[PDB]
Structure formats: C-alpha cells, structure tokens
C-alpha cells in the first residue's frame, strides 16, 4: 500500500484531462495515506520495536521481486511521458544518440501499467485479507478485524473504480485509436496476468 | 529493462531513512509515519 | 482555489524526499478539493444558471492577469525540473540548440 501511495498521482495527474477524475485520484491518494496511517497505528501497539520491523521487509527479496516487477514498467510510463512532453512529436536526438518518438507508444506503455494497477488491488492484496482474516471467528485480535474491515471496503471501492475505468477506456474505445492497443496488447496481457 | 536512465519511482533498498534533506535527494521508499524529522 | 488545486502535488511531489511531507501535500490537495466541492455547493443554490457564471470569470482579464502572473513562474519550475531530470548535470543539446 506504500508502493502505490504517491505513484498514481505523480504518474496520472500530468495526463488526466477532465478534472472530475483528478479529484478522484486525489481522494484515492488521500485514502491510501489514511491506510498508511492506520497501518502505523496498528503496528504501534504490537511489537515494542517499530524500528526493527523495517529491516527485512524493507528489502526482503520475497517482496522485493514483486515490488520491482510492479515498479519498473510503471515508472517506465512516467519517464516516457516526461520524454514525450520534453521532446514532442517527431524523432529527435537527446544529446548525441537519437531519441525515438511514438504517439501510440504513450498508450501501451501506460495501458499495460494500468493493468498492473488493477491486479495491484484485485488479487495480490486481496488474498492477504483472508490470510490476516482467519483470526476472526476464534476470539482473538478482534481489533485487527475491526480496523481492517474499513480498509477492505476502501480497497473494494478502489477495485470498482479502476475496473470501471479500464472497461470504459481499454474496452469500448471512444477515440478511434486505442482499439489497436486493445487488439495488440491482448495476448501479452494474459501472459503477464498469468505470470503475476 | 534498462540501465537506470534517470530518477526512479523508489529505490530497492535504504539510503539514509532518517537524515535526508528536506526536498532534495533520494525518493521515498517506505512510510514509517512514526519517527519523523520535524515534530 | 482551483488554480492551486492540482498544482502543488504535480509541482512538488517529484522533488520532496521525506514522505512525511508528501502525506501533508496530499492532505493539502484533498482539502483544496473539498474547498472546490463546497464552492460548487454554495453556487448550486444561488443563481439558476450555473453554466452562465463560467463565462466571464473563466477568462476575465481582471482575474486572468494575476492568474497568468501566478502560473507562468510556477510552471517554469515544473518544466525546469523535468529538464533537470531528463538531462542531468552538465550542459547538453536538446535536438540542435544547446
């Protein structure tokens, strides 16, 4: 949840046109921030060494693998958007070596990332719910369930919003350009989905 | 992927975690939210 | 208040290092958003033509002067940060001109 706290705003705000979606991504970031605060609260009354938990999990390969997998071709979109805004259309040469250019290139490199966004809040974080939730019927750690129910509601709203956005943009193309993206980035989409 | 062309979204490990400048240097990688630099 | 709703996040988040300030700028943006919602609420029960108020004040020179004055050398910082991140230290030549 910290890996996607500041990412969506800094990655999507420079591209969103309608402000009614900018407000939504702002509220999303704020909700993620509240989630982080609630996590810090629930960890501040369990282990007397809050500085000892951010040692392994900070850079544990078990989690670092998926962290890098979700961050690499998500910051790729940000850097490509920076390139597109700083160079514009037409090929160029950024200090020596030639600089590429693509109009549709600023779609797939984004759209596929959005797919990750979906599974970033559809499956991987959704199993951890049940994993930390079985301790509910047995009378123990009821405060954990009480504090996690609202987070689950929030995560579910995130899922609904992002799935609606994908189904509206990636499917049923309003502009007559992203249909080629939906056609091309289809089999590799299932490939990366099964990989995740 | 690539060869770390420029600034990234967040680092793979810690850099200082307690004594970075105000708004210059490495990005954020983990929100401790309990121990801050300015009360 | 709309001229500074999305500006601080998109202009400061790529530079802030400590996350404890990123949370604050996020809350600032959210509060500004709530302000915009409250303004839309207070205007939705005064004049029966909410689409008629965004005609002059949208591009009135009286306000547009200060709007441009506050936006020009505020987006200058954003574009210069983009340049610094895309080029790094040392002089360069962005497609021709240095």
Tab-separated table of C-alpha atoms in Angstrom:
chain	number	residue	atom	x	y	z
A	1	UNK	CA	0.000	0.000	0.000
A	2	UNK	CA	3.019	2.279	0.366
A	3	UNK	CA	4.258	1.292	-3.102
A	4	UNK	CA	1.082	2.878	-4.573
A	5	UNK	CA	0.612	5.796	-2.171
A	6	UNK	CA	2.274	8.535	-4.207
A	7	UNK	CA	2.632	6.655	-7.506
A	8	UNK	CA	-0.857	7.168	-9.036
A	9	UNK	CA	-0.921	10.946	-8.593
A	10	UNK	CA	2.602	11.590	-9.870
A	11	UNK	CA	2.005	9.129	-12.716
A	12	UNK	CA	-1.512	10.061	-13.873
A	13	UNK	CA	-2.156	13.700	-12.934
A	14	UNK	CA	0.033	15.134	-15.764
A	15	UNK	CA	-2.083	13.165	-18.269
A	16	UNK	CA	-5.668	13.356	-16.979
A	17	UNK	CA	-7.725	15.937	-18.865
A	18	UNK	CA	-11.130	16.027	-17.159
A	19	UNK	CA	-10.793	17.487	-13.629
A	20	UNK	CA	-13.570	15.234	-12.316
A	21	UNK	CA	-11.044	12.385	-12.487
A	22	UNK	CA	-8.263	14.480	-10.952
A	23	UNK	CA	-10.453	14.938	-7.884
A	24	UNK	CA	-10.953	11.173	-7.740
A	25	UNK	CA	-7.246	10.388	-7.947
A	26	UNK	CA	-6.629	12.994	-5.236
A	27	UNK	CA	-9.166	11.277	-2.982
A	28	UNK	CA	-7.558	7.933	-3.845
A	29	UNK	CA	-4.148	9.196	-2.740
A	30	UNK	CA	-5.668	10.628	0.444
A	31	UNK	CA	-7.413	7.335	1.212
A	32	UNK	CA	-4.136	5.439	0.645
A	33	UNK	CA	-2.485	7.909	3.055
A	34	UNK	CA	-5.151	7.192	5.674
A	35	UNK	CA	-4.471	3.494	5.111
A	36	UNK	CA	-0.777	4.047	5.826
A	37	UNK	CA	-1.642	5.965	8.996
A	38	UNK	CA	-3.923	3.146	10.155
A	39	UNK	CA	-1.180	0.598	9.486
A	40	UNK	CA	1.293	2.663	11.502
A	41	UNK	CA	-1.305	2.803	14.276
A	42	UNK	CA	-1.918	-0.952	14.314
A	43	UNK	CA	1.825	-1.652	14.345
A	44	UNK	CA	2.485	0.883	17.140
A	45	UNK	CA	0.833	-1.394	19.726
A	46	UNK	CA	2.069	-4.895	18.846
A	47	UNK	CA	5.881	-5.045	18.880
A	48	UNK	CA	7.854	-2.748	21.181
A	49	UNK	CA	10.468	-2.274	18.407
A	50	UNK	CA	8.831	-0.481	15.460
A	51	UNK	CA	12.335	0.266	14.149
A	52	UNK	CA	13.128	-3.465	13.963
A	53	UNK	CA	10.337	-4.393	11.536
A	54	UNK	CA	11.624	-2.086	8.774
A	55	UNK	CA	14.815	-4.124	8.355
A	56	UNK	CA	13.992	-7.303	6.412
A	57	UNK	CA	10.598	-6.426	4.904
A	58	UNK	CA	12.175	-3.165	3.733
A	59	UNK	CA	14.437	-5.094	1.339
A	60	UNK	CA	13.304	-8.723	1.505
A	61	UNK	CA	13.709	-10.433	-1.866
A	62	UNK	CA	10.426	-12.291	-1.281
A	63	UNK	CA	8.593	-8.963	-1.572
A	64	UNK	CA	11.288	-7.028	-3.429
A	65	UNK	CA	10.827	-9.215	-6.516
A	66	UNK	CA	7.177	-8.247	-6.966
A	67	UNK	CA	7.967	-4.683	-5.867
A	68	UNK	CA	10.479	-4.253	-8.690
A	69	UNK	CA	8.165	-6.066	-11.109
A	70	UNK	CA	5.363	-3.608	-10.337
A	71	UNK	CA	7.630	-0.542	-10.228
A	72	UNK	CA	9.777	-0.986	-13.355
A	73	UNK	CA	7.059	-0.955	-16.018
A	74	UNK	CA	5.172	1.662	-14.038
A	75	UNK	CA	7.947	4.245	-13.818
A	76	UNK	CA	8.637	3.447	-17.468
A	77	UNK	CA	5.327	5.167	-18.222
A	78	UNK	CA	6.317	8.230	-16.184
A	79	UNK	CA	9.704	8.589	-17.863
A	80	UNK	CA	8.180	8.082	-21.310
A	81	UNK	CA	5.578	10.764	-20.574
A	82	UNK	CA	8.379	13.097	-19.490
A	83	UNK	CA	10.183	12.344	-22.760
A	84	UNK	CA	7.038	12.964	-24.811
A	85	UNK	CA	6.378	16.290	-23.100
A	86	UNK	CA	10.000	17.473	-23.305
A	87	UNK	CA	10.504	16.445	-26.950
A	88	UNK	CA	7.089	16.396	-28.619
A	89	UNK	CA	6.284	14.537	-31.806
A	90	UNK	CA	8.894	13.669	-34.409
A	91	UNK	CA	12.203	11.921	-33.798
A	92	UNK	CA	14.975	13.803	-32.020
A	93	UNK	CA	18.440	13.318	-30.511
A	94	UNK	CA	18.787	13.849	-26.751
A	95	UNK	CA	22.415	14.946	-26.606
A	96	UNK	CA	24.044	12.649	-29.136
A	97	UNK	CA	22.185	9.364	-29.513
A	98	UNK	CA	18.868	9.727	-31.383
A	99	UNK	CA	15.633	10.000	-29.416
A	100	UNK	CA	12.708	7.855	-30.527
A	101	UNK	CA	9.115	9.064	-30.805
A	102	UNK	CA	5.660	7.487	-30.885
A	103	UNK	CA	2.102	8.680	-30.368
A	104	UNK	CA	0.670	5.219	-29.710
A	105	UNK	CA	3.797	4.401	-27.703
A	106	UNK	CA	2.446	6.689	-24.981
A	107	UNK	CA	-0.625	4.424	-24.751
A	108	UNK	CA	0.554	0.819	-24.359
A	109	UNK	CA	3.395	1.817	-22.023
A	110	UNK	CA	0.580	3.381	-19.997
A	111	UNK	CA	-2.315	0.975	-20.565
A	112	UNK	CA	-0.394	-2.175	-19.626
A	113	UNK	CA	0.776	-0.416	-16.465
A	114	UNK	CA	-2.863	0.304	-15.636
A	115	UNK	CA	-3.478	-3.439	-15.936
A	116	UNK	CA	-0.861	-3.940	-13.231
A	117	UNK	CA	-2.693	-1.275	-11.225
A	118	UNK	CA	-5.790	-3.461	-11.449
A	119	UNK	CA	-4.031	-6.568	-10.173
A	120	UNK	CA	-2.204	-4.319	-7.715
A	121	UNK	CA	-5.572	-4.006	-5.945
A	122	UNK	CA	-7.535	-7.029	-7.182
A	123	UNK	CA	-5.647	-10.194	-6.245
A	124	UNK	CA	-2.260	-9.751	-4.576
A	125	UNK	CA	-3.597	-7.514	-1.811
A	126	UNK	CA	-6.918	-9.389	-1.800
A	127	UNK	CA	-5.529	-12.728	-0.582
A	128	UNK	CA	-3.658	-11.061	2.282
A	129	UNK	CA	-7.107	-10.069	3.536
A	130	UNK	CA	-8.160	-13.673	4.151
A	131	UNK	CA	-4.659	-14.562	5.337
A	132	UNK	CA	-4.893	-11.960	8.109
A	133	UNK	CA	-8.650	-12.515	8.485
A	134	UNK	CA	-8.975	-16.154	9.590
A	135	UNK	CA	-8.252	-14.917	13.121
A	136	UNK	CA	-11.803	-13.562	13.358
A	137	UNK	CA	-14.229	-16.294	14.434
A	138	UNK	CA	-11.769	-17.538	17.035
A	139	UNK	CA	-11.892	-14.852	19.704
A	140	UNK	CA	-8.526	-13.110	19.309
A	141	UNK	CA	-7.183	-9.932	17.674
A	142	UNK	CA	-10.693	-8.595	17.085
A	143	UNK	CA	-9.326	-5.059	16.840
A	144	UNK	CA	-7.345	-6.137	13.782
A	145	UNK	CA	-10.530	-7.228	12.017
A	146	UNK	CA	-12.352	-4.090	13.161
A	147	UNK	CA	-9.640	-1.875	11.680
A	148	UNK	CA	-9.240	-3.980	8.527
A	149	UNK	CA	-12.936	-4.067	7.576
A	150	UNK	CA	-12.849	-0.398	6.566
A	151	UNK	CA	-9.607	-0.921	4.642
A	152	UNK	CA	-11.326	-3.773	2.808
A	153	UNK	CA	-14.284	-1.533	1.959
A	154	UNK	CA	-11.842	1.141	0.692
A	155	UNK	CA	-9.860	-1.453	-1.364
A	156	UNK	CA	-13.161	-2.708	-2.841
A	157	UNK	CA	-14.129	0.810	-3.892
A	158	UNK	CA	-10.688	1.207	-5.481
A	159	UNK	CA	-11.227	-2.044	-7.385
A	160	UNK	CA	-14.663	-0.966	-8.596
A	161	UNK	CA	-13.341	2.393	-9.769
A	162	UNK	CA	-10.274	1.077	-11.570
A	163	UNK	CA	-12.197	-1.785	-13.189
A	164	UNK	CA	-14.854	0.639	-14.425
A	165	UNK	CA	-12.128	2.924	-15.779
A	166	UNK	CA	-10.414	0.063	-17.612
A	167	UNK	CA	-13.680	-1.267	-19.043
A	168	UNK	CA	-14.589	2.237	-20.226
A	169	UNK	CA	-11.200	3.096	-21.755
A	170	UNK	CA	-9.495	-0.175	-22.710
A	171	UNK	CA	-12.830	-1.585	-23.912
A	172	UNK	CA	-15.375	0.293	-25.986
A	173	UNK	CA	-12.892	2.783	-27.412
A	174	UNK	CA	-14.350	6.281	-27.621
A	175	UNK	CA	-11.436	7.667	-29.606
A	176	UNK	CA	-10.631	5.511	-32.680
A	177	UNK	CA	-7.041	4.847	-31.640
A	178	UNK	CA	-6.972	2.592	-28.560
A	179	UNK	CA	-8.736	-0.226	-30.430
A	180	UNK	CA	-5.377	-1.130	-31.966
A	181	UNK	CA	-3.922	-1.144	-28.445
A	182	UNK	CA	-6.687	-3.466	-27.243
A	183	UNK	CA	-6.068	-5.755	-30.221
A	184	UNK	CA	-2.270	-5.874	-29.960
A	185	UNK	CA	-1.869	-5.786	-26.161
A	186	UNK	CA	-4.212	-8.738	-25.647
A	187	UNK	CA	-2.223	-11.992	-25.613
A	188	UNK	CA	0.723	-10.449	-23.764
A	189	UNK	CA	-1.851	-9.101	-21.305
A	190	UNK	CA	-2.990	-12.630	-20.467
A	191	UNK	CA	0.667	-13.691	-20.367
A	192	UNK	CA	1.623	-11.082	-17.762
A	193	UNK	CA	-1.630	-11.770	-15.906
A	194	UNK	CA	-0.864	-15.479	-15.558
A	195	UNK	CA	2.720	-14.563	-14.652
A	196	UNK	CA	1.509	-12.365	-11.788
B	1	UNK	CA	14.502	-3.374	-18.680
B	2	UNK	CA	17.132	-0.629	-18.938
B	3	UNK	CA	20.310	0.712	-17.310
B	4	UNK	CA	18.802	3.183	-14.795
B	5	UNK	CA	18.481	6.060	-17.238
B	6	UNK	CA	17.251	8.611	-14.692
B	7	UNK	CA	15.326	9.116	-11.438
B	8	UNK	CA	13.136	6.154	-10.472
B	9	UNK	CA	9.896	5.755	-8.548
B	10	UNK	CA	11.510	4.370	-5.370
B	11	UNK	CA	14.826	2.676	-4.550
B	12	UNK	CA	15.381	-1.021	-3.976
B	13	UNK	CA	16.993	-0.539	-0.542
B	14	UNK	CA	17.534	2.130	2.103
B	15	UNK	CA	19.628	5.242	1.515
B	16	UNK	CA	19.546	7.190	4.790
B	17	UNK	CA	15.978	6.679	6.088
B	18	UNK	CA	16.443	9.307	8.814
B	19	UNK	CA	18.588	12.292	7.742
B	20	UNK	CA	17.815	13.172	4.136
B	21	UNK	CA	17.434	16.804	3.014
B	22	UNK	CA	14.044	18.492	3.032
B	23	UNK	CA	13.041	18.200	-0.638
B	24	UNK	CA	16.212	17.045	-2.392
B	25	UNK	CA	17.890	13.659	-2.748
B	26	UNK	CA	16.612	10.103	-2.877
B	27	UNK	CA	12.869	9.423	-3.255
B	28	UNK	CA	10.581	7.791	-0.693
B	29	UNK	CA	10.605	4.006	-0.315
B	30	UNK	CA	8.726	3.287	2.947
B	31	UNK	CA	6.366	5.374	5.097
B	32	UNK	CA	7.383	4.751	8.704
B	33	UNK	CA	4.954	7.516	9.768
B	34	UNK	CA	6.042	7.203	13.422
B	35	UNK	CA	9.550	8.733	13.545
B	36	UNK	CA	9.836	11.979	11.577
B	37	UNK	CA	12.497	14.662	11.245
B	38	UNK	CA	10.361	17.616	12.400
B	39	UNK	CA	7.734	17.391	15.134
C	1	UNK	CA	-8.577	27.970	-5.180
C	2	UNK	CA	-8.908	25.982	-8.402
C	3	UNK	CA	-5.649	27.463	-9.718
C	4	UNK	CA	-3.815	25.732	-6.818
C	5	UNK	CA	-5.870	22.536	-6.534
C	6	UNK	CA	-3.679	20.219	-8.592
C	7	UNK	CA	-0.620	22.473	-8.928
C	8	UNK	CA	1.183	21.778	-5.605
C	9	UNK	CA	1.134	17.987	-5.925
C	10	UNK	CA	2.232	17.847	-9.562
C	11	UNK	CA	4.845	20.530	-8.862
C	12	UNK	CA	6.323	19.377	-5.535
C	13	UNK	CA	5.807	15.611	-5.238
C	14	UNK	CA	8.617	14.724	-7.722
C	15	UNK	CA	11.042	16.728	-5.548
C	16	UNK	CA	10.020	16.036	-1.938
C	17	UNK	CA	12.294	13.480	-0.280
C	18	UNK	CA	10.837	12.859	3.185
C	19	UNK	CA	7.460	11.064	2.888
C	20	UNK	CA	6.111	12.867	5.961
C	21	UNK	CA	5.820	15.961	3.752
C	22	UNK	CA	4.326	14.004	0.850
C	23	UNK	CA	1.474	12.995	3.145
C	24	UNK	CA	0.979	16.652	4.056
C	25	UNK	CA	0.856	17.826	0.449
C	26	UNK	CA	-1.608	15.017	-0.293
C	27	UNK	CA	-3.851	16.213	2.535
C	28	UNK	CA	-3.445	19.776	1.252
C	29	UNK	CA	-4.640	18.753	-2.207
C	30	UNK	CA	-7.551	16.836	-0.677
C	31	UNK	CA	-8.535	19.832	1.453
C	32	UNK	CA	-8.384	22.101	-1.626
C	33	UNK	CA	-10.633	19.564	-3.398
C	34	UNK	CA	-13.129	19.717	-0.529
C	35	UNK	CA	-12.994	23.504	-0.835
C	36	UNK	CA	-13.893	23.254	-4.522
C	37	UNK	CA	-16.785	20.925	-3.695
C	38	UNK	CA	-18.073	23.355	-1.062
C	39	UNK	CA	-17.852	26.226	-3.547
C	40	UNK	CA	-19.806	24.215	-6.113
C	41	UNK	CA	-22.372	23.512	-3.395
C	42	UNK	CA	-22.754	27.158	-2.379
C	43	UNK	CA	-23.105	28.228	-6.017
C	44	UNK	CA	-25.664	25.484	-6.791
C	45	UNK	CA	-28.353	27.286	-4.761
C	46	UNK	CA	-27.920	30.968	-5.659
C	47	UNK	CA	-28.225	31.500	-9.424
C	48	UNK	CA	-30.404	29.179	-11.503
C	49	UNK	CA	-27.776	29.277	-14.303
C	50	UNK	CA	-24.559	27.659	-13.036
C	51	UNK	CA	-23.415	27.419	-16.668
C	52	UNK	CA	-23.665	31.209	-17.061
C	53	UNK	CA	-21.166	32.107	-14.326
C	54	UNK	CA	-18.274	30.258	-16.005
C	55	UNK	CA	-18.279	32.643	-18.975
C	56	UNK	CA	-16.620	35.914	-17.923
C	57	UNK	CA	-14.808	34.866	-14.732
C	58	UNK	CA	-13.418	31.930	-16.715
C	59	UNK	CA	-11.390	34.327	-18.885
C	60	UNK	CA	-11.851	37.783	-17.359
C	61	UNK	CA	-8.706	39.882	-17.763
C	62	UNK	CA	-9.259	41.322	-14.272
C	63	UNK	CA	-8.507	37.876	-12.828
C	64	UNK	CA	-6.645	36.439	-15.815
C	65	UNK	CA	-3.775	38.891	-15.292
C	66	UNK	CA	-2.985	37.612	-11.799
C	67	UNK	CA	-3.764	34.048	-12.907
C	68	UNK	CA	-1.086	34.186	-15.603
C	69	UNK	CA	1.284	36.006	-13.245
C	70	UNK	CA	0.955	33.207	-10.686
C	71	UNK	CA	1.010	30.393	-13.262
C	72	UNK	CA	3.926	31.391	-15.518
C	73	UNK	CA	6.754	31.374	-12.972
C	74	UNK	CA	5.182	28.380	-11.271
C	75	UNK	CA	5.043	26.083	-14.293
C	76	UNK	CA	8.538	27.339	-15.094
C	77	UNK	CA	9.683	25.384	-12.036
C	78	UNK	CA	7.908	22.234	-13.237
C	79	UNK	CA	9.386	22.406	-16.731
C	80	UNK	CA	12.856	23.128	-15.354
C	81	UNK	CA	12.574	20.132	-13.020
C	82	UNK	CA	11.549	17.990	-15.992
C	83	UNK	CA	14.599	19.275	-17.884
C	84	UNK	CA	16.907	18.565	-14.943
C	85	UNK	CA	15.594	15.023	-14.552
C	86	UNK	CA	15.676	14.244	-18.286
C	87	UNK	CA	19.156	15.708	-18.878
C	88	UNK	CA	21.035	15.591	-15.575
C	89	UNK	CA	24.061	17.695	-14.751
C	90	UNK	CA	26.382	19.101	-17.393
C	91	UNK	CA	25.375	21.100	-20.456
C	92	UNK	CA	23.619	19.326	-23.311
C	93	UNK	CA	21.841	19.994	-26.615
C	94	UNK	CA	18.140	19.095	-26.808
C	95	UNK	CA	17.867	18.362	-30.520
C	96	UNK	CA	20.035	21.075	-32.028
C	97	UNK	CA	20.197	24.176	-29.850
C	98	UNK	CA	22.310	23.683	-26.700
